[PDB]
């Protein structure tokens, strides 16, 4: 139950509380960041490839 | 609980059942899934079969169980004991 779940989440529900976020890259439903729309795994992958503008490794 | 500025909630599909009964031969056996529906004083006297997730449990309503919800009278877990 992966493709159907992704499409159903992409669909409008009868109630507004039944809408939940999913990762726009791999379809994950857990740990999805609002700022990027991506899950933590995809976020790390894309950040290591320089494809996230202004995003850099943090160290202080 | 629910706020008194809002009314007490009934699903309006079971309320229609009891209301239509009250003027058309008011005693039968209704099966419902609305465990969240609140019992109403009009519902007193009816036997309602409430889903527990597996089966419909018949509940006969009385006066001292008016403000509760239907789901509180259909237990959902069977325990017995350990051993």
């Amino acid at each position: 139950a992966r493709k159907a779940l992704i499409e159903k989440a992409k669909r409008t529900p009868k109630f507004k509380v039944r809408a939940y976020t999913r990762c726009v890259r791999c379809g994950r439903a857990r740990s999805v960041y609002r700022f990027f729309g991506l899950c933590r795994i995809c976020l790390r992958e894309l950040a290591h490839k320089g494809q996230l503008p202004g995003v850099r490794k943090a160290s202080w | 609980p629910r706020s008194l500025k809002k009314g007490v909630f009934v699903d309006d599909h079971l309320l229609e059942k009891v209301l239509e009964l009250n003027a058309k031969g008011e005693k039968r056996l209704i099966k419902t899934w609305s465990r969240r529906s609140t019992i109403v004083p009009e519902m007193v006297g009816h036997t309602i079969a409430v889903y527990n997730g597996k089966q419909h449990v018949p509940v006969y309503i009385t006066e001292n169980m008016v403000g509760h919800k239907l789901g509180e009278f259909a237990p959902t877990r069977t325990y017995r004991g350990h051993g």
């Binding site: 795994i41 976020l43 490794k57 | -």
Partner: protein, 97 residues
């Protein structure tokens, strides 16, 4: 008239601010220098591995640098000349008054 310019990369933003300051003196209007505003830093922390290794993490940060430029006098000749400038695509501007 106040121009606020923001960007992810500070080098190109600084170059744009210096370009604005230098060009604004072609028809001098008592130019007010490009001042820096507090950088806004957004942090994200992720589990390093795809599964179960909570104690290992990686930190990422995204920073927004902000600079401000003011011209005391309008300088319409220098104002209409500011329409078509050399703006790096990473620099987002906003003019106001």
């Amino acid at each position: 008239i106040r121009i606020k310019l923001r960007g992810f990369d500070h080098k190109t933003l600084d170059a744009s601010a210096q370009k604005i300051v230098e060009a604004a003196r072609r028809s001098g209007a008592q130019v007010s220098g490009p001042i820096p505003l507090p950088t806004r830093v957004r942090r994200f922390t992720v589990i390093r591995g795809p599964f179960k290794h909570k104690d290992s993490r990686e930190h990422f940060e995204l920073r927004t640098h902000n600079r401000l430029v003011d011209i005391i006098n309008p300088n319409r000749k220098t104002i209409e000349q500011l329409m078509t400038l050399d703006l790096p695509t990473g620099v987002e501007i906003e003019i106001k008054t």
